[PDB]
Amino acid sequence: FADRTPHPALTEAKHQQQFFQFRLSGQTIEVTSEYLFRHSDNELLHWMVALDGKPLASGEVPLDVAPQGKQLIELPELPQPESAGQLWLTVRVVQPNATAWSEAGHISAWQQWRLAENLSVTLPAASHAIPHLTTSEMDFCIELGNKRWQFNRQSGFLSQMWIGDKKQLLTPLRDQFTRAPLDNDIGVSEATRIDPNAWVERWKAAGHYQAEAALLQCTADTLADAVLITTAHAWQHQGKTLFISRKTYRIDGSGQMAITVDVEVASDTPHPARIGLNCQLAQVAERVNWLGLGPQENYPDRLTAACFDRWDLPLSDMYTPYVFPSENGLRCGTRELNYGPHQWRGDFQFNISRYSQQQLMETSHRHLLHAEEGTWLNIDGFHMGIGGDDSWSPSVSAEFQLSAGRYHYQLVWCQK
Amino acid sequence: YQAEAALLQCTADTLADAVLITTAHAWQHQGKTLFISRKTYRIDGSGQMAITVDVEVASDTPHPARIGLNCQLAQVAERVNWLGLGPQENYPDRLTAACFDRWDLPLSDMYTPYVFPSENGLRCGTRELNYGPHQWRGDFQFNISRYSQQQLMETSHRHLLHAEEGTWLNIDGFHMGIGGDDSWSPSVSAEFQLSAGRYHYQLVWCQK
């Protein structure tokens, strides 16, 4: 920023430009120096092995590597854990002494890898309680304990949840296919000249920002130990069907709601910016806790610098205050997200903030944004790349466009 | 090639207009779980069985060659009719020459008689497959023949293959590339390896 505070992209540049390169082969790390002139004489290697965020082993090895040379580092016999989960190895190079340009403890390079994984073969504990379905003309209602879920039969969306008598939502949980456009999506360098190839112009012409959901199907069933709700929706613009969404919600005896989503995208509409859900939660909590890539904002084509771990930040750090407001704050590769009493599990991307995608789209300056009631949560199965080879022509590479035609993802929403 | 399936779950429910069967299986070798498969079968009033499959693959096992189903059908029909890429054999990294259309061939053209027997005969990008009275719909790859994968693996020469009873059908959600930059080192590019960790696909099996 003009006051010399960093954008989140500065950390991506730091990692890609590091002077040490690392390879892992079994138990050996190979450290290669990209210095031309100096020996590594102010460097030590911290390693750590963790299992789904919880630490298991650590260590430090002093680096002694000639300019353009290699050093092999053998790790001690790693622990075999009983429990299920992915093991991660993380190395960081730390400078123990101050320089002319850095403080003591400056981290100059890092790298992360997956080691062994144990898949969970334990079937969930069978609960005695059965959730109760009630059916009016307007609604399906599911009660279990103090918990309640309500699905509106005209819209076919989850419209409210209660814990006790405390309502949890301010807006229903609905599909989302759009983002507040980034500067690379707008694709303008001269304010007098408009490109029709720009992502935002293609999305606007096709009607993605205006598409209205039509309900196709909405039904409810009692199984032995669960309630199943099944919905389908079509998004249309002027006769043309752009997207179809088929969902199942399965509410079991433990109180966990499992959501399964299957989406079809017309092959001739421009590829959507995202495929996910959004809602506005009634509460405002101080912290956000997640297990996945961080701690900084990261996108599918800018995530090499983020590391998988357990992160905890205050809510205001989950928003990036770009001077011209846009989509911001995404965290990728997430397995678990905790916010107040809510927990979401899956394999997803999310952003969480006090500003809707709509408010970010209609406001031209950050100082004119005002916090909305509650918190806006965007949970995505899939998200387009952000580009940036330049900003005045389309620049998202084809491997980061959402061009597969069929998409599938699942979440579990529960109360921790 | 040795992994044994262990049953985790198998339950049945009557819905308003359908029956739902739900299964889970773990494939193991010496304590280590290699794959987990969760399936639903939903049999409705029109007689269509809808099958939904979700697979997890351990990150540290080598990427599998395919993710799909197989069975041996009792009947032997003369023709195979499909809507998808053809008419020749095509694989995920060798399909640029095949065109999407409606193809009809005799069963013996669905097998490629390579002198040293191997996996052969795959057709990709398929939306519909008709064989005798059966129809399968989805978005899948298939091969159909009189030889099991096991017989093709254990036999060294094509002239020693013998037709089995009925027909062997392999239906795949996903299939690895075949390589061929050379034949004496690994040569399948990373975009054609099955490295995603989680896989999902669905079929409808019905009688036409």
Side-chain angles (χ1 to χ4, degrees), chain A residues 86 114-115 117 119-121 123 221 223-224 262 335 347 406 408 410, chain B residues 8 13 15-16 26 32-34 36 54 57-60 127 139 198 200:
Chain A
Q86 178 67 250
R114 287 154 118 86
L115 306 170
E117 179 174 43
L119 296 175
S120 176
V121 290
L123 43 104
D221 286 287
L223 313 185
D262 284 283
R335 298 327 280 274
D347 182 33
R406 279 161 304 283
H408 170 85
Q410 47 203 346
Chain B
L8 300 182
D13 286 287
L15 313 185
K32 168 90 189 151
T33 295
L34 298 175
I36 302 165
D54 284 283
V57 178
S59 80
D60 56 316
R127 298 327 280 274
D139 183 33
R198 279 161 304 283
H200 170 85

PDB file of all heavy atoms in Angstrom, chain A residues 86 114-115 117 119-121 123 221 223-224 262 335 347 406 408 410, chain B residues 8 13 15-16 26 32-34 36 54 57-60 127 139 198 200:
ATOM      1  N   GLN A  86      -3.739 -36.903   7.533  1.00  0.00           N
ATOM      2  CA  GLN A  86      -2.559 -36.666   6.697  1.00  0.00           C
ATOM      3  C   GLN A  86      -1.421 -36.132   7.591  1.00  0.00           C
ATOM      4  O   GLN A  86      -1.652 -35.220   8.390  1.00  0.00           O
ATOM      5  CB  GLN A  86      -2.970 -35.672   5.603  1.00  0.00           C
ATOM      6  CG  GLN A  86      -1.834 -35.274   4.665  1.00  0.00           C
ATOM      7  CD  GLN A  86      -1.345 -36.401   3.788  1.00  0.00           C
ATOM      8  OE1 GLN A  86      -0.238 -36.917   3.959  1.00  0.00           O
ATOM      9  NE2 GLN A  86      -2.179 -36.798   2.840  1.00  0.00           N
ATOM     10  N   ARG A 114       3.283 -33.348   1.882  1.00  0.00           N
ATOM     11  CA  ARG A 114       2.521 -34.447   2.481  1.00  0.00           C
ATOM     12  C   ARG A 114       3.440 -35.660   2.688  1.00  0.00           C
ATOM     13  O   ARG A 114       4.183 -36.046   1.784  1.00  0.00           O
ATOM     14  CB  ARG A 114       1.403 -34.889   1.545  1.00  0.00           C
ATOM     15  CG  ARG A 114       0.226 -33.939   1.433  1.00  0.00           C
ATOM     16  CD  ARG A 114      -0.438 -34.152   0.080  1.00  0.00           C
ATOM     17  NE  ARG A 114      -1.812 -34.613   0.191  1.00  0.00           N
ATOM     18  CZ  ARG A 114      -2.877 -33.819   0.340  1.00  0.00           C
ATOM     19  NH1 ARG A 114      -2.790 -32.514   0.117  1.00  0.00           N
ATOM     20  NH2 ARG A 114      -4.032 -34.334   0.730  1.00  0.00           N
ATOM     21  N   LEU A 115       3.400 -36.260   3.880  1.00  0.00           N
ATOM     22  CA  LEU A 115       3.999 -37.604   4.079  1.00  0.00           C
ATOM     23  C   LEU A 115       2.865 -38.650   4.078  1.00  0.00           C
ATOM     24  O   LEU A 115       1.901 -38.501   3.324  1.00  0.00           O
ATOM     25  CB  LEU A 115       4.789 -37.607   5.390  1.00  0.00           C
ATOM     26  CG  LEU A 115       5.841 -36.512   5.552  1.00  0.00           C
ATOM     27  CD1 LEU A 115       6.372 -36.481   6.977  1.00  0.00           C
ATOM     28  CD2 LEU A 115       6.985 -36.681   4.558  1.00  0.00           C
ATOM     29  N   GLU A 117      -0.485 -40.929   4.897  1.00  0.00           N
ATOM     30  CA  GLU A 117      -1.892 -40.663   5.232  1.00  0.00           C
ATOM     31  C   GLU A 117      -2.552 -41.963   5.718  1.00  0.00           C
ATOM     32  O   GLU A 117      -2.318 -43.034   5.143  1.00  0.00           O
ATOM     33  CB  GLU A 117      -2.640 -40.148   4.002  1.00  0.00           C
ATOM     34  CG  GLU A 117      -4.115 -39.866   4.264  1.00  0.00           C
ATOM     35  CD  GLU A 117      -4.900 -39.209   3.137  1.00  0.00           C
ATOM     36  OE1 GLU A 117      -4.723 -39.617   1.964  1.00  0.00           O
ATOM     37  OE2 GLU A 117      -5.700 -38.292   3.436  1.00  0.00           O
ATOM     38  N   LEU A 119      -6.390 -43.361   6.073  1.00  0.00           N
ATOM     39  CA  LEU A 119      -7.817 -43.062   5.830  1.00  0.00           C
ATOM     40  C   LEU A 119      -8.648 -43.577   7.011  1.00  0.00           C
ATOM     41  O   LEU A 119      -8.368 -44.648   7.569  1.00  0.00           O
ATOM     42  CB  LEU A 119      -8.286 -43.718   4.526  1.00  0.00           C
ATOM     43  CG  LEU A 119      -7.645 -43.255   3.217  1.00  0.00           C
ATOM     44  CD1 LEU A 119      -8.158 -44.095   2.051  1.00  0.00           C
ATOM     45  CD2 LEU A 119      -7.892 -41.774   2.954  1.00  0.00           C
ATOM     46  N   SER A 120      -9.678 -42.815   7.363  1.00  0.00           N
ATOM     47  CA  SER A 120     -10.571 -43.124   8.486  1.00  0.00           C
ATOM     48  C   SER A 120     -11.596 -44.194   8.071  1.00  0.00           C
ATOM     49  O   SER A 120     -12.444 -43.950   7.195  1.00  0.00           O
ATOM     50  CB  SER A 120     -11.247 -41.855   8.966  1.00  0.00           C
ATOM     51  OG  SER A 120     -12.180 -42.130  10.000  1.00  0.00           O
ATOM     52  N   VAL A 121     -11.519 -45.365   8.706  1.00  0.00           N
ATOM     53  CA  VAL A 121     -12.448 -46.485   8.443  1.00  0.00           C
ATOM     54  C   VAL A 121     -13.409 -46.681   9.630  1.00  0.00           C
ATOM     55  O   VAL A 121     -13.971 -47.771   9.802  1.00  0.00           O
ATOM     56  CB  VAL A 121     -11.696 -47.793   8.104  1.00  0.00           C
ATOM     57  CG1 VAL A 121     -11.009 -47.728   6.751  1.00  0.00           C
ATOM     58  CG2 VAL A 121     -10.715 -48.217   9.192  1.00  0.00           C
ATOM     59  N   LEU A 123     -16.853 -46.067  11.295  1.00  0.00           N
ATOM     60  CA  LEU A 123     -18.255 -45.691  11.075  1.00  0.00           C
ATOM     61  C   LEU A 123     -18.764 -44.900  12.290  1.00  0.00           C
ATOM     62  O   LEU A 123     -18.489 -45.291  13.432  1.00  0.00           O
ATOM     63  CB  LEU A 123     -19.092 -46.948  10.798  1.00  0.00           C
ATOM     64  CG  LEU A 123     -18.820 -48.169  11.683  1.00  0.00           C
ATOM     65  CD1 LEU A 123     -19.913 -48.339  12.729  1.00  0.00           C
ATOM     66  CD2 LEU A 123     -18.697 -49.431  10.841  1.00  0.00           C
ATOM     67  N   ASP A 221     -38.289 -36.905   3.076  1.00  0.00           N
ATOM     68  CA  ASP A 221     -38.456 -38.310   3.431  1.00  0.00           C
ATOM     69  C   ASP A 221     -37.922 -38.584   4.816  1.00  0.00           C
ATOM     70  O   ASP A 221     -36.901 -38.019   5.220  1.00  0.00           O
ATOM     71  CB  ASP A 221     -37.706 -39.204   2.436  1.00  0.00           C
ATOM     72  CG  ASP A 221     -38.408 -39.303   1.085  1.00  0.00           C
ATOM     73  OD1 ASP A 221     -39.456 -39.982   1.000  1.00  0.00           O
ATOM     74  OD2 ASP A 221     -37.900 -38.714   0.103  1.00  0.00           O
ATOM     75  N   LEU A 223     -36.093 -41.436   6.704  1.00  0.00           N
ATOM     76  CA  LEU A 223     -35.354 -42.708   6.713  1.00  0.00           C
ATOM     77  C   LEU A 223     -35.416 -43.285   8.135  1.00  0.00           C
ATOM     78  O   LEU A 223     -36.131 -42.748   8.987  1.00  0.00           O
ATOM     79  CB  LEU A 223     -33.902 -42.493   6.263  1.00  0.00           C
ATOM     80  CG  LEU A 223     -33.660 -41.662   5.000  1.00  0.00           C
ATOM     81  CD1 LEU A 223     -32.186 -41.661   4.627  1.00  0.00           C
ATOM     82  CD2 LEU A 223     -34.488 -42.159   3.832  1.00  0.00           C
ATOM     83  N   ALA A 224     -34.682 -44.373   8.380  1.00  0.00           N
ATOM     84  CA  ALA A 224     -34.663 -45.055   9.684  1.00  0.00           C
ATOM     85  C   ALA A 224     -34.111 -44.118  10.769  1.00  0.00           C
ATOM     86  O   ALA A 224     -34.732 -43.952  11.827  1.00  0.00           O
ATOM     87  CB  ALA A 224     -33.867 -46.335   9.588  1.00  0.00           C
ATOM     88  N   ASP A 262     -24.714 -31.160  -6.668  1.00  0.00           N
ATOM     89  CA  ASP A 262     -24.295 -31.494  -8.056  1.00  0.00           C
ATOM     90  C   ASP A 262     -24.710 -30.420  -9.067  1.00  0.00           C
ATOM     91  O   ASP A 262     -25.888 -30.108  -9.189  1.00  0.00           O
ATOM     92  CB  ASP A 262     -24.835 -32.866  -8.453  1.00  0.00           C
ATOM     93  CG  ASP A 262     -24.043 -33.999  -7.802  1.00  0.00           C
ATOM     94  OD1 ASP A 262     -22.923 -34.288  -8.288  1.00  0.00           O
ATOM     95  OD2 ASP A 262     -24.516 -34.594  -6.801  1.00  0.00           O
ATOM     96  N   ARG A 335     -10.271 -27.886   5.341  1.00  0.00           N
ATOM     97  CA  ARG A 335     -10.938 -29.130   5.746  1.00  0.00           C
ATOM     98  C   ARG A 335     -11.962 -28.852   6.843  1.00  0.00           C
ATOM     99  O   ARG A 335     -12.896 -29.626   7.008  1.00  0.00           O
ATOM    100  CB  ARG A 335      -9.947 -30.161   6.305  1.00  0.00           C
ATOM    101  CG  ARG A 335      -8.873 -30.625   5.325  1.00  0.00           C
ATOM    102  CD  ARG A 335      -9.287 -30.694   3.854  1.00  0.00           C
ATOM    103  NE  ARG A 335     -10.048 -31.903   3.559  1.00  0.00           N
ATOM    104  CZ  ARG A 335      -9.511 -33.083   3.248  1.00  0.00           C
ATOM    105  NH1 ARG A 335      -8.219 -33.182   2.963  1.00  0.00           N
ATOM    106  NH2 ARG A 335     -10.270 -34.166   3.233  1.00  0.00           N
ATOM    107  N   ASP A 347     -14.024 -30.266   1.856  1.00  0.00           N
ATOM    108  CA  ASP A 347     -12.794 -29.901   1.149  1.00  0.00           C
ATOM    109  C   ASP A 347     -13.146 -28.707   0.270  1.00  0.00           C
ATOM    110  O   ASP A 347     -13.597 -28.897  -0.869  1.00  0.00           O
ATOM    111  CB  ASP A 347     -12.293 -31.067   0.297  1.00  0.00           C
ATOM    112  CG  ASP A 347     -10.969 -30.756  -0.420  1.00  0.00           C
ATOM    113  OD1 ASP A 347     -10.122 -30.002   0.127  1.00  0.00           O
ATOM    114  OD2 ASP A 347     -10.776 -31.284  -1.542  1.00  0.00           O
ATOM    115  N   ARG A 406     -19.505 -30.374 -15.400  1.00  0.00           N
ATOM    116  CA  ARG A 406     -20.185 -31.020 -14.232  1.00  0.00           C
ATOM    117  C   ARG A 406     -19.314 -30.934 -12.973  1.00  0.00           C
ATOM    118  O   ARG A 406     -18.111 -31.179 -13.025  1.00  0.00           O
ATOM    119  CB  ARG A 406     -20.554 -32.477 -14.513  1.00  0.00           C
ATOM    120  CG  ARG A 406     -21.842 -32.637 -15.311  1.00  0.00           C
ATOM    121  CD  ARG A 406     -21.999 -33.994 -15.983  1.00  0.00           C
ATOM    122  NE  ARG A 406     -20.868 -34.310 -16.857  1.00  0.00           N
ATOM    123  CZ  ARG A 406     -20.658 -33.806 -18.079  1.00  0.00           C
ATOM    124  NH1 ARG A 406     -21.606 -33.123 -18.705  1.00  0.00           N
ATOM    125  NH2 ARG A 406     -19.484 -33.970 -18.666  1.00  0.00           N
ATOM    126  N   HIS A 408     -19.202 -31.473  -8.477  1.00  0.00           N
ATOM    127  CA  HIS A 408     -19.787 -32.133  -7.319  1.00  0.00           C
ATOM    128  C   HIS A 408     -19.020 -31.716  -6.062  1.00  0.00           C
ATOM    129  O   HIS A 408     -17.800 -31.647  -6.119  1.00  0.00           O
ATOM    130  CB  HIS A 408     -19.730 -33.665  -7.515  1.00  0.00           C
ATOM    131  CG  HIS A 408     -20.088 -34.382  -6.261  1.00  0.00           C
ATOM    132  ND1 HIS A 408     -21.413 -34.639  -5.922  1.00  0.00           N
ATOM    133  CD2 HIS A 408     -19.320 -34.793  -5.215  1.00  0.00           C
ATOM    134  CE1 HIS A 408     -21.453 -35.211  -4.731  1.00  0.00           C
ATOM    135  NE2 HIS A 408     -20.168 -35.316  -4.272  1.00  0.00           N
ATOM    136  N   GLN A 410     -19.388 -31.664  -1.291  1.00  0.00           N
ATOM    137  CA  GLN A 410     -20.220 -31.919  -0.118  1.00  0.00           C
ATOM    138  C   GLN A 410     -19.647 -31.243   1.129  1.00  0.00           C
ATOM    139  O   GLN A 410     -18.437 -31.116   1.273  1.00  0.00           O
ATOM    140  CB  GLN A 410     -20.444 -33.413   0.119  1.00  0.00           C
ATOM    141  CG  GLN A 410     -19.190 -34.271   0.052  1.00  0.00           C
ATOM    142  CD  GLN A 410     -19.502 -35.719  -0.264  1.00  0.00           C
ATOM    143  OE1 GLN A 410     -20.646 -36.170  -0.196  1.00  0.00           O
ATOM    144  NE2 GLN A 410     -18.472 -36.470  -0.621  1.00  0.00           N
TER     145      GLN A 410
ATOM    146  N   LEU B   8     -18.066 -52.165   5.349  1.00  0.00           N
ATOM    147  CA  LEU B   8     -18.213 -51.258   6.494  1.00  0.00           C
ATOM    148  C   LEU B   8     -19.693 -51.058   6.838  1.00  0.00           C
ATOM    149  O   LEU B   8     -20.044 -51.017   8.014  1.00  0.00           O
ATOM    150  CB  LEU B   8     -17.540 -49.915   6.190  1.00  0.00           C
ATOM    151  CG  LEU B   8     -16.035 -49.927   5.890  1.00  0.00           C
ATOM    152  CD1 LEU B   8     -15.530 -48.509   5.654  1.00  0.00           C
ATOM    153  CD2 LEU B   8     -15.224 -50.590   6.996  1.00  0.00           C
ATOM    154  N   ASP B  13     -33.641 -48.628   2.701  1.00  0.00           N
ATOM    155  CA  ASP B  13     -34.733 -47.747   3.097  1.00  0.00           C
ATOM    156  C   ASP B  13     -35.799 -47.694   2.031  1.00  0.00           C
ATOM    157  O   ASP B  13     -35.494 -47.708   0.834  1.00  0.00           O
ATOM    158  CB  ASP B  13     -34.210 -46.324   3.333  1.00  0.00           C
ATOM    159  CG  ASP B  13     -33.426 -46.189   4.634  1.00  0.00           C
ATOM    160  OD1 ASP B  13     -34.051 -46.205   5.719  1.00  0.00           O
ATOM    161  OD2 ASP B  13     -32.183 -46.052   4.570  1.00  0.00           O
ATOM    162  N   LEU B  15     -38.262 -45.106   0.521  1.00  0.00           N
ATOM    163  CA  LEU B  15     -38.733 -43.724   0.352  1.00  0.00           C
ATOM    164  C   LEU B  15     -40.177 -43.772  -0.170  1.00  0.00           C
ATOM    165  O   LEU B  15     -40.770 -44.853  -0.240  1.00  0.00           O
ATOM    166  CB  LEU B  15     -37.819 -42.953  -0.612  1.00  0.00           C
ATOM    167  CG  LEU B  15     -36.306 -43.055  -0.397  1.00  0.00           C
ATOM    168  CD1 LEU B  15     -35.561 -42.134  -1.350  1.00  0.00           C
ATOM    169  CD2 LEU B  15     -35.918 -42.741   1.034  1.00  0.00           C
ATOM    170  N   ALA B  16     -40.734 -42.611  -0.520  1.00  0.00           N
ATOM    171  CA  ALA B  16     -42.117 -42.495  -1.009  1.00  0.00           C
ATOM    172  C   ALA B  16     -42.285 -43.273  -2.323  1.00  0.00           C
ATOM    173  O   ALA B  16     -43.212 -44.082  -2.457  1.00  0.00           O
ATOM    174  CB  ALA B  16     -42.493 -41.041  -1.165  1.00  0.00           C
ATOM    175  N   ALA B  26     -13.886 -50.837   2.339  1.00  0.00           N
ATOM    176  CA  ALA B  26     -12.470 -50.450   2.419  1.00  0.00           C
ATOM    177  C   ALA B  26     -11.623 -51.533   1.749  1.00  0.00           C
ATOM    178  O   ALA B  26     -11.854 -52.725   1.963  1.00  0.00           O
ATOM    179  CB  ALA B  26     -12.064 -50.298   3.863  1.00  0.00           C
ATOM    180  N   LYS B  32      -2.939 -51.538   5.922  1.00  0.00           N
ATOM    181  CA  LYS B  32      -3.011 -50.233   5.244  1.00  0.00           C
ATOM    182  C   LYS B  32      -4.282 -50.179   4.376  1.00  0.00           C
ATOM    183  O   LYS B  32      -4.496 -51.050   3.522  1.00  0.00           O
ATOM    184  CB  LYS B  32      -1.720 -50.064   4.431  1.00  0.00           C
ATOM    185  CG  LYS B  32      -1.677 -48.924   3.423  1.00  0.00           C
ATOM    186  CD  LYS B  32      -1.157 -47.621   3.984  1.00  0.00           C
ATOM    187  CE  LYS B  32      -1.330 -46.479   3.006  1.00  0.00           C
ATOM    188  NZ  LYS B  32      -1.496 -45.187   3.710  1.00  0.00           N
ATOM    189  N   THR B  33      -5.135 -49.182   4.612  1.00  0.00           N
ATOM    190  CA  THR B  33      -6.311 -48.930   3.780  1.00  0.00           C
ATOM    191  C   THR B  33      -5.876 -48.172   2.514  1.00  0.00           C
ATOM    192  O   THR B  33      -5.331 -47.077   2.609  1.00  0.00           O
ATOM    193  CB  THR B  33      -7.393 -48.204   4.592  1.00  0.00           C
ATOM    194  OG1 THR B  33      -7.825 -49.100   5.620  1.00  0.00           O
ATOM    195  CG2 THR B  33      -8.582 -47.765   3.761  1.00  0.00           C
ATOM    196  N   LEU B  34      -6.127 -48.744   1.338  1.00  0.00           N
ATOM    197  CA  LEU B  34      -5.706 -48.129   0.075  1.00  0.00           C
ATOM    198  C   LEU B  34      -6.828 -47.257  -0.501  1.00  0.00           C
ATOM    199  O   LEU B  34      -6.553 -46.170  -0.990  1.00  0.00           O
ATOM    200  CB  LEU B  34      -5.330 -49.221  -0.940  1.00  0.00           C
ATOM    201  CG  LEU B  34      -4.160 -50.149  -0.601  1.00  0.00           C
ATOM    202  CD1 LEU B  34      -4.038 -51.219  -1.673  1.00  0.00           C
ATOM    203  CD2 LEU B  34      -2.858 -49.377  -0.518  1.00  0.00           C
ATOM    204  N   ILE B  36     -11.310 -46.141  -0.219  1.00  0.00           N
ATOM    205  CA  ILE B  36     -12.666 -46.315   0.368  1.00  0.00           C
ATOM    206  C   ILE B  36     -13.713 -45.928  -0.674  1.00  0.00           C
ATOM    207  O   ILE B  36     -13.599 -44.892  -1.323  1.00  0.00           O
ATOM    208  CB  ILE B  36     -12.877 -45.500   1.664  1.00  0.00           C
ATOM    209  CG1 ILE B  36     -11.862 -45.863   2.749  1.00  0.00           C
ATOM    210  CG2 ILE B  36     -14.310 -45.658   2.191  1.00  0.00           C
ATOM    211  CD1 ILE B  36     -11.791 -44.859   3.885  1.00  0.00           C
ATOM    212  N   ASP B  54     -18.736 -42.535  -4.573  1.00  0.00           N
ATOM    213  CA  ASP B  54     -17.704 -41.598  -4.051  1.00  0.00           C
ATOM    214  C   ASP B  54     -16.457 -42.326  -3.537  1.00  0.00           C
ATOM    215  O   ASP B  54     -16.554 -43.169  -2.653  1.00  0.00           O
ATOM    216  CB  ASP B  54     -18.306 -40.700  -2.972  1.00  0.00           C
ATOM    217  CG  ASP B  54     -19.184 -39.604  -3.571  1.00  0.00           C
ATOM    218  OD1 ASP B  54     -18.617 -38.615  -4.093  1.00  0.00           O
ATOM    219  OD2 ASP B  54     -20.436 -39.726  -3.543  1.00  0.00           O
ATOM    220  N   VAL B  57      -8.817 -42.101  -2.153  1.00  0.00           N
ATOM    221  CA  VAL B  57      -7.579 -42.809  -2.430  1.00  0.00           C
ATOM    222  C   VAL B  57      -6.496 -42.296  -1.472  1.00  0.00           C
ATOM    223  O   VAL B  57      -6.190 -41.109  -1.490  1.00  0.00           O
ATOM    224  CB  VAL B  57      -7.143 -42.580  -3.897  1.00  0.00           C
ATOM    225  CG1 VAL B  57      -5.811 -43.265  -4.212  1.00  0.00           C
ATOM    226  CG2 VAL B  57      -8.208 -43.017  -4.904  1.00  0.00           C
ATOM    227  N   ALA B  58      -5.885 -43.161  -0.669  1.00  0.00           N
ATOM    228  CA  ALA B  58      -4.743 -42.758   0.212  1.00  0.00           C
ATOM    229  C   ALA B  58      -3.687 -41.962  -0.579  1.00  0.00           C
ATOM    230  O   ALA B  58      -3.319 -42.362  -1.682  1.00  0.00           O
ATOM    231  CB  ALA B  58      -4.143 -43.982   0.854  1.00  0.00           C
ATOM    232  N   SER B  59      -3.191 -40.841  -0.041  1.00  0.00           N
ATOM    233  CA  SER B  59      -2.278 -39.970  -0.824  1.00  0.00           C
ATOM    234  C   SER B  59      -0.904 -40.626  -1.077  1.00  0.00           C
ATOM    235  O   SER B  59      -0.226 -40.294  -2.056  1.00  0.00           O
ATOM    236  CB  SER B  59      -2.149 -38.585  -0.226  1.00  0.00           C
ATOM    237  OG  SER B  59      -1.246 -38.575   0.873  1.00  0.00           O
ATOM    238  N   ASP B  60      -0.492 -41.549  -0.215  1.00  0.00           N
ATOM    239  CA  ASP B  60       0.827 -42.169  -0.326  1.00  0.00           C
ATOM    240  C   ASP B  60       0.882 -43.504  -1.115  1.00  0.00           C
ATOM    241  O   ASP B  60       1.981 -44.017  -1.381  1.00  0.00           O
ATOM    242  CB  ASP B  60       1.436 -42.346   1.069  1.00  0.00           C
ATOM    243  CG  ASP B  60       0.534 -43.151   2.012  1.00  0.00           C
ATOM    244  OD1 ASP B  60      -0.697 -42.906   2.045  1.00  0.00           O
ATOM    245  OD2 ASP B  60       1.072 -44.019   2.736  1.00  0.00           O
ATOM    246  N   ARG B 127     -21.896 -41.123 -23.323  1.00  0.00           N
ATOM    247  CA  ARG B 127     -23.094 -40.654 -22.614  1.00  0.00           C
ATOM    248  C   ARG B 127     -24.115 -41.782 -22.489  1.00  0.00           C
ATOM    249  O   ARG B 127     -24.951 -41.744 -21.596  1.00  0.00           O
ATOM    250  CB  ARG B 127     -23.786 -39.499 -23.351  1.00  0.00           C
ATOM    251  CG  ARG B 127     -22.943 -38.238 -23.516  1.00  0.00           C
ATOM    252  CD  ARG B 127     -21.959 -37.932 -22.387  1.00  0.00           C
ATOM    253  NE  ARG B 127     -22.619 -37.314 -21.243  1.00  0.00           N
ATOM    254  CZ  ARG B 127     -22.852 -36.007 -21.113  1.00  0.00           C
ATOM    255  NH1 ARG B 127     -22.286 -35.137 -21.939  1.00  0.00           N
ATOM    256  NH2 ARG B 127     -23.662 -35.576 -20.160  1.00  0.00           N
ATOM    257  N   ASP B 139     -21.620 -40.189 -17.760  1.00  0.00           N
ATOM    258  CA  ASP B 139     -20.492 -39.574 -18.462  1.00  0.00           C
ATOM    259  C   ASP B 139     -19.265 -40.402 -18.106  1.00  0.00           C
ATOM    260  O   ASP B 139     -18.618 -40.130 -17.085  1.00  0.00           O
ATOM    261  CB  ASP B 139     -20.306 -38.122 -18.021  1.00  0.00           C
ATOM    262  CG  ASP B 139     -19.171 -37.410 -18.775  1.00  0.00           C
ATOM    263  OD1 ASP B 139     -18.928 -37.711 -19.973  1.00  0.00           O
ATOM    264  OD2 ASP B 139     -18.522 -36.532 -18.156  1.00  0.00           O
ATOM    265  N   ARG B 198      -9.885 -37.479  -4.242  1.00  0.00           N
ATOM    266  CA  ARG B 198     -11.357 -37.727  -4.123  1.00  0.00           C
ATOM    267  C   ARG B 198     -12.027 -37.730  -5.503  1.00  0.00           C
ATOM    268  O   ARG B 198     -11.751 -36.869  -6.336  1.00  0.00           O
ATOM    269  CB  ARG B 198     -12.043 -36.708  -3.212  1.00  0.00           C
ATOM    270  CG  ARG B 198     -11.903 -37.025  -1.729  1.00  0.00           C
ATOM    271  CD  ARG B 198     -12.163 -35.841  -0.807  1.00  0.00           C
ATOM    272  NE  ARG B 198     -11.304 -34.698  -1.123  1.00  0.00           N
ATOM    273  CZ  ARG B 198     -10.012 -34.578  -0.799  1.00  0.00           C
ATOM    274  NH1 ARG B 198      -9.443 -35.418   0.054  1.00  0.00           N
ATOM    275  NH2 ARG B 198      -9.282 -33.622  -1.349  1.00  0.00           N
ATOM    276  N   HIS B 200     -15.797 -38.712  -7.813  1.00  0.00           N
ATOM    277  CA  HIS B 200     -17.240 -38.894  -7.759  1.00  0.00           C
ATOM    278  C   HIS B 200     -17.760 -39.208  -9.164  1.00  0.00           C
ATOM    279  O   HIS B 200     -17.302 -38.580 -10.108  1.00  0.00           O
ATOM    280  CB  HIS B 200     -17.902 -37.613  -7.202  1.00  0.00           C
ATOM    281  CG  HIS B 200     -19.381 -37.660  -7.358  1.00  0.00           C
ATOM    282  ND1 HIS B 200     -20.193 -38.291  -6.419  1.00  0.00           N
ATOM    283  CD2 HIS B 200     -20.186 -37.265  -8.382  1.00  0.00           C
ATOM    284  CE1 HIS B 200     -21.446 -38.257  -6.838  1.00  0.00           C
ATOM    285  NE2 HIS B 200     -21.467 -37.626  -8.052  1.00  0.00           N
TER     286      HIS B 200
END
